[PDB]
């Protein structure tokens, strides 16, 4: 040491960290990037448990994002700043178990709650170096320890033989779980609470933290949750052990490869071989599906998320829940023939039809012909654009908006205090059409207040906007509720229940108090078409 | 003698009576015998003309109502007691009632002809809710209305025998019709412009007479009020038919030829002492002989009639009340009754619609309850108890209603639709029933006309209206005044706009689409799941 900056200097379990003062729009906030928390799951520990970084010597600078875990880049719209957001902007490699910390400058005196944020991706993709999901907003504006970490995708992360020793599948979700381990022991050098940590995050984030609820090892690891835009239940999120098996045997002979010497062939493809071939393995053509995704292997998961949130007890539990107002729109574009970014996407009653089969790929064909019947408008059956909204409502509301609402009502029920939300503003700068009205993913950005850098171009009241919802957040993190304590004057937020099944809509105007998520609708998916699949 | 009363028909002569209407005098002829009385050999067969007569017949009173099943559920109840039969009961009752102005049209004047309902078990063209003379008076219309045989006289059916070969109550209508053709002229109606009429079973009835082509000669528009040929309770296979008889005579004593000589020994309220008995589940809303699915009367299914009939030269109106259910849930579902709310538990909900649909599956059922249920209120009595309601209603006349009117359309027919929803000043049900199926009658007929009934003047001016709209459908096939120019008028009914029009003391609205989400589910999924 001697010249450098005092105050970006810090020891963890395993060494000595130097991070990088970061300009906010409000001042600096202190940042620690690339902090390894696991041994590189890399040869022969590929699809392996993670095991606990061995101690380093000197000081590890921890300036810098980063390699990105090893995974499909998407080509469907090349250049195009509304599929490229998302995809990685660092290396790829195996070699990807590095988290990161942003925390006030100079760090906080007393003790500061700490947020958690676990990426989507479909368990596919993902990075924790992406510009949305960018900490020093929170950090600086709200005093937040806001900590991201990369977790293993795609069939490095969750590819199973279920029983095996060398491909237990889940290991993606073990990767999250040791960067939780990893903050509590370590979170206190910055300044962060370990006694209060809030995990949130978006699609598969979500997912992966409904499935830390369920899963009793990660309990002592957290104490309260948010879940934007995603569930541990409903149709994409798990898998059986036997499809789980089936899937991987399957991408095992489309590479040309007892389970021990399966997965030993496997170990010895290229990173990129396996990642040409994930899309190859799914039952059907759909959309809203993806290839390798956690198991139900009885262990991580004891039985089906279904199974879990229907019966355990939540009482202890605070949760934040909530959808966008256009949940299914993204996905039509990536698979449903009549969609496209480019055109207004008007479909015939016909192209609904098939791609209903698409969006619930598996529904029997009564079960399909229930769908079409829900949500067709009888007064205008074949009116192109109440089909193509139609068509994003299907696959928004049976992936999202209706597992949501059973995750609400079952936690609601058993002893959970649960806030439930609608998003419903669209960006000003959103690159994609506006059919696709108020999209996937594009609430995060205000979350994590991108609208407070003015060079990003938002409009002021979206920066008043971002304030409002980074209160919400960071209190809800603070307190179990995301109510200012001291402002009553504004209206209030109600927790959702069984009885009044309150939830709130978030946009440029004031928080207004409605009732039932999607209610009628979701009695068909929820309670209507599990019976029918029972026949 | 008043040479107004006094006409000579086809089998002789007759001497009808001058009655008052609030607006003047009408002739009126009742009690006129259009068929060979359908006793002792005759029972349970087709009818047969009546022969001529010496004399002059007097028809100055209502004649025998057709023996029936009399309703005991609310022993003097004005609500159910205006239903029951007002004059003795009798095998021997098929006869027809005209009212004309008085004196006699001059120029041929259009008929409308009265079909009652009943559910093919009860009814009569003597009710004072189907007076005719208010029609006559005001609207210059000839009225007709006839008895027809119902229950197991009407309906009784061993599908091939030659002794009950089935629908010979429809028979009986059939023949008022051919009757009105060769005798209506001598009143001054025109028998080129017959419009049927009818409501529920008697709507079925009129619906049943467009889908047969030998009447098809004998009117020329239709009337359908809250019932259809189509649909569950209208109608029975020949194979059900076969087995509702058998099972009566078994029920009372007894190849078709010797069981049917049984049957016709036993006196008369043997048989309806067992009407109710052979009904394949416990229900609502069923009745045990109804028109029977011959390949005679009805070469086919009404289903698959409306589906591929010919409609182009042919008019309908049709419509439903705005709370057809409510009436029928007292009959049958436990926690029903005209006496208090009848606010029902959840569970009393589940065991109502397993009465309601009971020709539906578990997962039939199951898929009824998740649809009726208002999930943001799911346990809350008011909402379960107008959503049984809902269900018994919407099952057995508005969805079957909108079937028909929507394969009418489609299939060159002209087609009316409404929704009436005024509740009578005077009802007494209670007021959880809302608008209740049967109680557009009397507007229709236009008894607010009448003083002593304590109708409000709202009421008296809205009945008015409603008999221009039906005569002026009688008169041309379109409810319009060709007088009134001013808007909104009454439009079609068509696949692509769906529009009906609200009958209140508002004026006229027209809305879009009846009930065409909830119509989708019995309509179109409903069938898909029961038959796989
Ligand atoms: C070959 C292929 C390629 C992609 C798919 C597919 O279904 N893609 C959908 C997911 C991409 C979303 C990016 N994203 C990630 C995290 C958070 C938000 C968002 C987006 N915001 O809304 C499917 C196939 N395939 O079926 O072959
Ligand atoms: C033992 C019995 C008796 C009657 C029923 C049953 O379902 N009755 C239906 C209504 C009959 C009278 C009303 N009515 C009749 C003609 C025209 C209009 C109206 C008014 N309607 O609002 C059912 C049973 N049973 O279940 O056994
Ligand atoms: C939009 O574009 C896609 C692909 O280019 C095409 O299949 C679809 O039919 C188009 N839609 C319209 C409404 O032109
Ligand atoms: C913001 O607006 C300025 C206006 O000159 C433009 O030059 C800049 O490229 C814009 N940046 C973004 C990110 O939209």
Redesign the interface.
Known sequence: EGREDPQLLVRVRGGQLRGIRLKAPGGPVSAFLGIPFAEPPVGSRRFMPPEPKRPWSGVLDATTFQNVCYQYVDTLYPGFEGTEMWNPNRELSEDCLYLNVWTPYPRPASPTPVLIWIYGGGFYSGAASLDVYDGRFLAQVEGAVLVSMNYRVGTFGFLALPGSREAPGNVGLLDQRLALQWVQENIAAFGGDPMSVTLFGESAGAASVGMHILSLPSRSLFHRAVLQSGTPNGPWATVSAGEARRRATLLARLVGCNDTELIACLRTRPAQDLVDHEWHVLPQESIFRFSFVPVVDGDFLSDTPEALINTGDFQDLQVLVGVVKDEGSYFLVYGVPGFSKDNESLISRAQFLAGVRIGVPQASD?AA??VV?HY?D??HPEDPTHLRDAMSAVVGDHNVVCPVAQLAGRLAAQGARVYAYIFEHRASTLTWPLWMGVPHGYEIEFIFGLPLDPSLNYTTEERIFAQRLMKYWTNFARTGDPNDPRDSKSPQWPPYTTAA?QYVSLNLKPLEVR??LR??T???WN??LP??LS?
């Open positions: 009564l012909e229930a019947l067709t009888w007064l099944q009732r039932g209610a009628q979701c009695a068909f309670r209507f019976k029918l026949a």
